[PDB]
Amino acid sequence: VNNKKISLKISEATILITKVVRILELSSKCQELITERKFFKVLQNLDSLEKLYLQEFKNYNFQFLIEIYNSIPFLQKVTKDECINLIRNSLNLNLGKNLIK
Amino acid sequence: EFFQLDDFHDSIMIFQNLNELSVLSGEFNKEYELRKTKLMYPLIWKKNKFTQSLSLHFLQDYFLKILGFLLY
Amino acid sequence: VPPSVFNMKVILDPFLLFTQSTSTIVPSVLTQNTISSLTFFDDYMNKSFLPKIQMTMDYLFTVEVESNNPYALELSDENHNIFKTALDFQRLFYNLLNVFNTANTFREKISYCILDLLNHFYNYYLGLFNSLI
Amino acid sequence: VTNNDIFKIISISHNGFTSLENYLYNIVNIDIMEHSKTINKNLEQFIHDQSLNKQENEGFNRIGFLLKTINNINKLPVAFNIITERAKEEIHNIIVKSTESIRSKHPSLLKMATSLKNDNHFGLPVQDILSIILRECFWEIFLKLLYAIQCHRAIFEMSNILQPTSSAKPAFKFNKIWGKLLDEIELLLVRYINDPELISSNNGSIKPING
Amino acid sequence: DYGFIPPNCNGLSCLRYLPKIVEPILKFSTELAQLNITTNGITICRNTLSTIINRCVGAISSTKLRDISNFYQLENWQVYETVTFSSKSQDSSKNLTFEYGVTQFPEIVTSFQEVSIKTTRDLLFAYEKLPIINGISVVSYPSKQLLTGIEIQQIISMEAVLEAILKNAAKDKDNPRNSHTILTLTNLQYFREC
Amino acid sequence: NNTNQDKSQGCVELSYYLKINQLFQIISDTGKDSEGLKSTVEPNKVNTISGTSYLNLNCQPSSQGLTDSPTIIEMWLLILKYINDLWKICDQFIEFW
Amino acid sequence: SLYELDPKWKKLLKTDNFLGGLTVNEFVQELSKDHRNDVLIDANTKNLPTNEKDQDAIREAIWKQLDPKPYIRTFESTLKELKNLNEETLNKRQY
Amino acid sequence: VTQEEFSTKRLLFKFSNSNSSLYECRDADECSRLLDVIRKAKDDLCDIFHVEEENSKRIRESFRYLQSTQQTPGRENNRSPNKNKRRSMGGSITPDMSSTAQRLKFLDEGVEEIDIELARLRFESAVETLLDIESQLEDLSLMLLNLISLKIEQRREAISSKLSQSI
Amino acid sequence: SQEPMLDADRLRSSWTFSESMDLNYSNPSSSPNSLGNLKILLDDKASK
């Protein structure tokens, strides 16, 4: 029970560390998804994030939502942010103009 | 005023992976062009394409004025 | 050709140390007494790597087509086009890469870069064979 | 064992580029003094172990292959066994195995494809950046396969030349005649899969016209 | 050490590498007869050491001179590249702004480094330095040849001002072409305090 | 080097062809700066304006005295390989005697 | 923004944290990432096709409303890492 | 060794890398005590040497050789005029940049804001933003800092060229 | 073909590697005759 104590703080410490790691990665993806109507650090910081989470930084098989999220986010964030920005200023193309006369 | 500022930054971020990322704006500009060029003596007709008589002096200064600011 | 790659112009990492086996078993030296189909260095450096250099040059010219009869920037002029300073950048880059001294330096790698020049004069000849002609 | 005490191990401080002083291309390769060394070793123990019965760099070859390979009592099928296993499964085992070892060792195949470095940035980073790896990798491949087909010429001699003890010698002779036709095939496709990515060639799916 | 034709020289190539191929043979010698086995060939190291050493330092000097006469030729087709000055006037009033012509600054370097290398041949014979002492080279040795090094370096700087003489006067007619030929007087004016 | 030469005689103008600014401040980086200050040598036009000190390390791989690919192969390979081998031989004789 | 982001995890994770004790620290790795009461509802995230009325943006927000949900829950597991620091407090007491 | 008793109790799923074992224990008490004692060999695997500092400190010292210096020299090395897959250490395992280069790291995103503002031809504010970045950079000048200044002067070139075309 | 010195163009050489981009053409190498030659080579390369 001193080795259940030391074992408890041991695996509690390690799971605290990995919990801090996945907390960091999902925190970064929250920092990505938070950015609406900016579209500029979207591909910058988001593509910086995808270079770590699905990639080498969190490349254990650890979660499902980390794996499916960071594996998914190519087409979702890239295609959705992409065509979001494409139909952005088509709004302005409708707004440019009606002030012709 | 900022009439291509969105098109500017749009073309920047989309031009990280140019250029079909901004090629459909050719289509949207051709379409909403073809609405705004239209019509008033119908005037999406400039693609080898009555309504002639729906035009007079106020419609004239209207028409070539509005097309003039379109060219601007 | 669809440039997946044959290998690349990236044999400069590989093809140094993989000539040691072409010279320590000296291809093919030992290889005791039979009919053994010896060289094999070249035979791909004859066939494969040379045609991969030729078509690799050709696709490299297709990374400077740019679809403009013309447009450019040109501190002194019009200079028509980005095509022009493209083929300048290409032939300057490759003609620093593929040969500097030694003039052959080449089986026909000389004649390869000569063929890139010949294609460039074919295309910018074709612009005048289109706009004027 | 005594085949290229490694270049590019390591760095003669400071003297770092040219690629190093070791290579390039002062690692001659002339015909190689390296190949005078190795092709002196196998000619030494081959025709001098043969001449003997008509660490010395590298005594394990003729030593272990001798006292091993002569102490067989029904050897003649087992020669075909080591041949027919080792050709395909060994050649693809090593040539797979090294590229696997780098392919997860410090990969990071980041510099994923070219990082779009145009076009004709054709192995640009050497210059000692990230083609310091692949030179050590493909160098270690052609080195290991060299000592391999060396040694298969050394058993294709060692007892087959000359009937120690079997005058049915053409087994391992076939395992040079199609031993070397094995390995020169297995490198040749490893030529064609040096495609311009650091192609890493570890998928094996073969799909027909219907997915 | 050259090695090839042009550039062990202008091209600081024996200026860098020659210290390496110098220094290892120096340690190999100093050890190789520091074992005092036995006698009357330690003399032969005392001959061969100063032979190759002084011949080498003469070689770097010769490269540096015939190099540095070609320096300003095909170099300064430039503009006021490097800096500035702070030279006070006759009324001591802030009158510089004397700038720049970077061929000043390059030849301000390529002799200072050669001073560092020849410092590492004159003062080479300190750090070896073991028993017997078979001290086969004197740490502050050749006062005759030290005066000769003073002579050759003086000839080097004289070759510099000759190089601006030829490059200024006729090579050929453009410091740019009067177009600040005042550039050339600006460079010389910096050279009076460089 | 050079057969059918520049003729004559094939200098690189290497104290420009390298040392326009180069190893001129990289081989001279254990060489420069040692009190080699700037005095507004922020090169105020365009490019060579890093120049603070120690390090802001560029810190050039320094191809050679620049255009010497093969001549740095010559001085390097010849002089360093031969003298390296003789360092090994004198080591073995140092043990032997 | 409390342990209501991990409500049943006060049993479904914390009892497996209290007397579990973590069994077997791959479940604390992966099944606490499959995340009893938090990301055991891990289905249909999904950045919903079809066309952007239905929905493609709310389910895209719910593609990472585990960054809301399982990270105020994993953050609540980081708040339970403070309870694991409380387990490291008493694990600093009996040790 | 997966815990696949859900498809079949008294059966095991040991899929070692490029393999798969259906090594079916006959009783399930040997299966439950087998994956249970392999979960106690995850109290040996997952507790003894899973990582616990191993991938942690291996990621520390191994990540600590990042772009080019660990391992200083150097006589075949430089990283002056490039980005060359630029290791964004702020977004990497440092996240905790020094508030000089942290607050200028967001002004490195302010440098990218200058790239937006240049990219819409609005020079003025981006120029003065760059003046602020020169001010804080200038004053509070710990190693990557210099490379940040390289990007800065790169973009000062971009401005000077761009205005000199635009005038 | 004349390189010659540049710097031009873009990454201040942007190619600069350059082992004939891939060769030495390292014949065996083993062939030091060198012929005292020639023009370099008109060879119809001049005609090229």
SS3 annotation, F69-90? CHHHHHHHHHHHHHHHHHHHHH
Task: Give the number of F-H residue pairs with CB atoms closer than 8 Å.
Answer: 29
Partner residue facing F81 (CB), from D17, D21, D128: D21
Tell me the C-alpha distance between H140 and H163, whole Å.
29
Partner residue facing D119 (CB), from C26, C36, C60: C60
User: Quick check: do A and H touch, 3+ CB pairs under 8 A?
Assistant: yes
Best interface-test mutation with I: which of C5, C97, C119 has the largest number of I CBs within 10 A?
A: C97
CA-to-CA dists, residue D48 to D43, D45, D58, D64, angstroms: 7, 5, 13, 16
Q: At H92, phi and psi to the nearest 5?
A: -80, -160
Tell me the C-alpha distance between A8 and A13, whole Å.
8
Tell me the C-alpha distance between E10 and F64, whole Å.
11
Chains that touch I (3 or more CB pairs under 8 A): C, D, F, H
Tell me the C-alpha distance between A27 and A19, whole Å.
12
Closest residue by Cα to residue E136 from E33, E12, E22: E33
Q: Which two tokens stand for residue B68?
A: 């003039």
Q: Which two tokens stand for residue D83?
A: 């041949």
Inter-chain CB proximity D30 and I30 less than 8 Å:
yes
- Side-chain-facing half-sphere of D181: CA atoms under 13 Å: 11
Residues paired with residue H2 on neighbouring β-strands, in sequence order: H13
Q: Which element (helix H / strand E) includes H144?
A: helix H144-166
Q: CB-based burial of residue E34 (10 Å sphere; 0-12 exposed, 13-18 middle, 19+ buried)?
A: buried
Q: Which two tokens stand for residue G5?
A: 């982001």
Q: Is the peptide bond before F2 cis (omega within 30 degrees of 0)?
A: yes
Closest residue by Cα to residue E4 from G40, F7, F69: F69
Instruction: Please spell the DSSP secondary structure of A69-101, one letter per residue.
Output: HHHSHIIIIIIHHHHHHHHTTHHHHHHS-S---
H62 CA: distance to closest CA in chain D (Å)? 9
User: Quick check: do B and A touch, 3+ CB pairs under 8 A?
Assistant: yes
CB I46 within 8 A of CB C39: no
Tell me the C-alpha distance between B62 and B72, whole Å.
15
Q: Which element (helix H / strand E) includes H165?
A: helix H144-166
SS3 string of A21-61? HHHHHHHHHHHHHHCCCCCCCHHHHHHHHHCCCCCHHHCCC
If you search the block for the tokens 């003298």, which residue do you land on? F83
Count of C-beta atoms within a 10 Å radius of residue G85 = 18
Partner residue facing B9 (CB), from A40, A82, A94: A40
Q: At H14, phi and psi to the nearest 5?
A: -100, 90
Experimental approach was: cryo-EM
B34 CA: distance to closest CA in chain H (Å)? 27
If you ran DSSP here, which 8-state letter would residue C16 be given? Answer: T
Tell me the C-alpha distance between H130 and H147, whole Å.
16
CB B6 within 8 A of CB A92: yes
Spatial CB neighbours of H126, under 8 Å, sequence gap ≥ 6: H113, H114, H117, H118, H159
CB D179 within 8 A of CB D152: yes
Q: Give CA A93 to chain center in angstroms.
A: 31
Chains that touch C (3 or more CB pairs under 8 A): D, F, I
Tell me the C-alpha distance between G91 and E141, whole Å.
73
Which residues in chain A are contacts of G29 at CB distance < 8 A?
15, 18, 62
If you ran DSSP here, which 8-state letter would residue A5 be given? Answer: H
Query: ∠ CA A59-G33-G28 to the nearest 5 degrees?
Result: 100
Label residues H109-131 b or e (16+ Cβ within 10 Å = b).
bbbbbbbbbbbbeeeeebeebbe
Q: Which amino acid appears at position I9 of this protein?
A: D
CB D136 within 8 A of CB D97: no
Dihedral angle of Cα B49, B53, B57, B58, to the nearest 10 degrees:
-80
CB F59 within 8 A of CB F25: no
Spatial CB neighbours of H51, under 8 Å, sequence gap ≥ 6: A14, H58
